[PDB]
Design a protein around this nucleic acid. Sequence first.
RNA 1: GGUAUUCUGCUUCUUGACCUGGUACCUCUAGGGUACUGGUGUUCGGUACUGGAUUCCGAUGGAAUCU
RNA 2: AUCCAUGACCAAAGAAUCGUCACAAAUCGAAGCUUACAAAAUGGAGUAAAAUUUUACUCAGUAAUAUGCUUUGGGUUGAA
Lengths: 169, 126, 243, 780
Amino acid sequence: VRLKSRYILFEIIFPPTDTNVEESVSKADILLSHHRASPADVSIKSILQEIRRSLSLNLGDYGSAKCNSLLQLKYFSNKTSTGIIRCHREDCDLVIMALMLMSKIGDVDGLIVNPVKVSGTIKKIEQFAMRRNSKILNIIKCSQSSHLSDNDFIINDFKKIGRENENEN
Amino acid sequence: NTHNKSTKRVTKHPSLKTLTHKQIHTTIFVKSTTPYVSALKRINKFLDSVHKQGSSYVAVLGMGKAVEKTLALGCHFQDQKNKKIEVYTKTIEVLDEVITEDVEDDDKETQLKKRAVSGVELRIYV
Amino acid sequence: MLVDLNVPWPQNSYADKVTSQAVNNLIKTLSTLHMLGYTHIAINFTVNHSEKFPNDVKLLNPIDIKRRFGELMDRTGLKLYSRITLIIDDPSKGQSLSKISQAFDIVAALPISEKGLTLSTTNLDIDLLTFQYGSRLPTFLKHKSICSCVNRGVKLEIVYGYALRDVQARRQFVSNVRSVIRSSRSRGIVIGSGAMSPLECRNILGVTSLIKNLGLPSDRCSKAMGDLASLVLLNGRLRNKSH
Amino acid sequence: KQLQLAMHNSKAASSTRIFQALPRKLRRRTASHNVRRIPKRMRNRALREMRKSDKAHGLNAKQLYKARMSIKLLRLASKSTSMKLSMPPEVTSSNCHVRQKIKTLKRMIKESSTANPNIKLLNNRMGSYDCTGVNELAPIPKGRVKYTKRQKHFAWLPTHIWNAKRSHMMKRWGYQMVWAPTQKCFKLTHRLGGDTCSSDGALCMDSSYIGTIIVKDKSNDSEGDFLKSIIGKLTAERANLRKYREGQVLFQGLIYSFNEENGEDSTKPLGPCDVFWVQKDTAIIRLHPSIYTQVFNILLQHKEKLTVQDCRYSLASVTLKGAKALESLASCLRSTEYSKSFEQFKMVSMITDHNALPQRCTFAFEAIDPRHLAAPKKLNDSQRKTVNSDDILSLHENYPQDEINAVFNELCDPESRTQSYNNQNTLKEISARRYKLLTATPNSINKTTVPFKESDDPSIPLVIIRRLKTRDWIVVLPWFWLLPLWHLLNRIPRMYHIGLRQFQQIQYENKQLYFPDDYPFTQLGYIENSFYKKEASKTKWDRKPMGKRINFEKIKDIHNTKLPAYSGEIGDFFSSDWRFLQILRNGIDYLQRNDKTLELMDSKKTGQQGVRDINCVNDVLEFCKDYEAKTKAMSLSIEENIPVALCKNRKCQFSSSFSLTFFPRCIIAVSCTLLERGHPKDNARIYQVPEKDLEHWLQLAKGVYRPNGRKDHDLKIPLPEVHDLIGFITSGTYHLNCGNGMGIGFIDHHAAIRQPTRYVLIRNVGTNTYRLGEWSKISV
RNA sequence: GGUAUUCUGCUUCUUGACCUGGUACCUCUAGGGUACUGGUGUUCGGUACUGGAUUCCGAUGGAAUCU
RNA sequence: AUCCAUGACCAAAGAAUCGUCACAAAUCGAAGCUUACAAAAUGGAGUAAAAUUUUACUCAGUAAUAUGCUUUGGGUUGAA
């Protein structure tokens, strides 16, 4: 036979969690504030190291060895924190448990790691990511005139993440 | 003159059309009994595979029951989706069969008549 | 839809009023929960069932839901509700719940000792039951106590909030959740979230796995935040016909 | 071999273009690389024939065959390369030139039996003639000797050697017809041959198996008026009326078998029929093969007054379906002269939605050999694109009657279509004629199609008719001309051929019946139902180990209360059993002779003049059980328990004649659509909706929602009795034109005319789940 | 008169190996093709079509451009 | 001439039904609900009021009901 696989698409949300801010309330501003980029101190190695730390403490040897057999980080972007990870089909829930029970990546603090979808093939998570980015761009360009979000935290990024690092067939 | 006391059977015919294999793949005929989400999905999936036919718009198109329904869909694409649409009002002519007017069955003599209605074409850009 | 119904309201008793920073924190955490996917939310409130309830029929629910949060029920579609978490310790001290029934939608109970726990399942007016998963539940609880209430219209609740604060509370949480699952034979379990901060919230498609790898069948993990949590809210709202 | 020329060629393109892989319907796999292998039986005979060394001097009794086959063996084993016999046998090492040229070919065969009479060779260099029997049946057309040996029982269609390479065949009714192609075509059939508007192609079916009978009067008076009586008796009084005779529009209905010759007489439906009138004293009849002979001999009872030609071996036909159908056919047809009926054909081949055209759209003209074109070609139609609804009204007044009749009458005469072959060209001489076009006189044209001669080339009569009920195009042609045309018609880039299953699916989608499978009131539909499908199903059922198949008599909670007669399911497990329906419904009706309140069972009254009392309904069920496997599984009896709906009114009825199998119970044909989940397969059962729980089912129809917001499905499904069975479903699958499951079937007539609503309950065979549905009538 | 078995007749038909030597003939341009008649002296043939759009010509035909 | 037990060989076939799984899009995947109309376009049918005009209404019932409904996914007539 052939070995199955599962791909997990994880984002990183950086909530403000600071007092004396009194933000505005609108679907555009909440997303535009929670979705700031990553401070570039995180890397492809920091996330993997932290997700290995969170398994050998919230699970034991027989929980940190049934997942570490096949666990590879494929694609990660800093302009938008989306990333893709790969694991065995029967041992994907333990990786999710590692995801939630883990915060404070490396030294960066006050953040949430958010797995948004899991799927078998790799051809389909690409389409899902494209649809997700299209949906975000549509919702940010409809609240008002789009260029009131002129800071361009993410607007120039979705178009330019087309296939630059996504040629992993 | 003559009052149209034609309560006898009338077999309404579809309007005469003609296609060119380019209007086949870039046109939608909204029926009266079309569920809303059905046509929504159909339109949403033609605006993704129309460039390869060398076109730049999709022609939603309907009359009678369809018109307000049609217009509703147009609204959903004007705002909340940020696309530009054009509206055209058209007149249409269709043909109706009427009998010439023992006991015989449905198979009676036929005569054609012409009747006109009005509809709307609505072009949604990409 | 998704229902999360254990967001705490920053007030300890009927004496103090709400400050500014507390409500400022509450609004931010509500916005974050709205982003993560939740649509319907309820707001908690803790008392002791042995205190002087306001005599007048007003100002007994200081939530003030229609003036505050008026700019969040529009500009984004999430809806908000109200609930109170009575703490029962003694089999006496009156104050029968016929009074506060009209002023809320969801009434819960948080028994502490054996007498309180056996009173709670005996005869009250609650429509939900909760425990203190933080530490030191009164152990050896069996199907005998819980069967009678769960046969009637009562539900059990898990919070999963204490799994996020500290390791020492995490161990007690994971110890007690297994007991409460296996005592009720996986019947009438719903999930809330104790979010004291805009950091202690989580998504859906992982917490279901967090409950599935503890003992709950995968067929029930998909109805905690769902049909049962919707039915409790539907009944609570339909109770408002007292007027 | 220099890439500079490759760069120069690509200069007529982009820098670095990308090409797609082939579509999956145009791919082939590589065969073997070594030459083919001969059978051993053809090797031994040739080897022993060459190794052999060499009283009117003929003396050739039965040895003529030996010589005439040894010649073929010598030629084959002297010509073919795949023949690897041994080392010695060669063309010259053994006497092959001397043999069979100066020893056998002329000294032996020629000098024994003189050539028999009828040395009329032909008017062709390809065997092509007519096979018609005036007032008698006709045999198989002569052809290749090898392939005419296998047609002793089942004949061949003109295209059989072509279809056999690309389809799954079967053998029925004396023909070897085509069932289905070798690819999945469920959705493509719908969206290219259905009533959709997304059609960019067409479907062509070789329907030569449908016979053709050309009946005509012989009183020499054009008024006829006796063929009118025959046609009006043969069917109901339909196909002899002003609409069908004078307007000569096509007819489709039901054909009977009258037998009025001595006192008591009756009629029994047989099946569909196509009757076309011409000049008021000629008729053409098209029939399914199964009912071909039975009606035919009937006409032979009056051949003193009419004349009949079994021309089913001389006329061929093709059926076309789809939107771009006439556009593709018109790309392979040209004329000889100028005729208005080709102008109309040119104009109407640009509609793309054939439902707008009127009732009658007959075309008829004379085409040329379609092998001239060498490639299908459009009709330069793009110039004119302003067709409106005003020129269509001209088609009902500008009808070329005489020009249709004159070209039509060259099909109802054997010698005329014999002259039609007067000089049929071989492929090589057409090739040479085309080659002679590289040195033409205009010298500024570069034409490809060969010219046409005024008198030294044949003219092919051709008719095209439109069938409204089936919504398709018939094209009728002489037999031996079919193969040259059919070769071009399949070179269109988007033309697909279909078998017989696709025809059934197409006629299912349009809410219409199907003669073989879905006529349980005809003498052959009943056989196909209760004798042919049942064996094919049971043979594969009882031939499985027990426990690896659905147990039929062990099913729980089928009905609200259980009768001990049937342990599990009701009726036969493999077919729509109509005998049980008749017996059960008649017994239920008799149980309410004067006691309105029925009663199911009385607890152990007794066991049984051969008394069979009619007290309880369990008694009716055990009567039905007794009547089967002990009265018709060991003996034979024939009856038609299923009539069809009649315009008259004979609803009601009532110790002398009270048998439960003596009167036919009228039914009707309906189509049922499901409002909720369901997927009705074949032979499923149809129950009426009980008066109790009507409110619950109505509420389910309106909609019951969970607190979540979705639909509520998991409730308590109530159940009806066993005397609520009123119908069966004969064809059902997922209906793509509406997106929900749908079925077609029959229901008892008296059941529907007493329903207070319009809902029914559907459940498959071997299951206890009841789905809801709503039914609508079919006017057949 | 029948069926299973056994021996003897009859009917089913498109002038067809390859190479090559002769005579007669042909509407073919000194050479080609066809009839009658002699000589033992492992894959190779012909004919044929791309999908779509726009344009031009006193036409059931012909011509040009782009993709 | 009969039966039972063990062993060898040959041959057939490789279970059916019901329920749940968050997003103006979803799911571990796929598909369906596009021959534009109620004969209200021979320039629709009627009711009330005021000096043809002006101002108020009735008539469309399988009516229509909004990211909604329905079907299906390893050997389909065993070996993919």
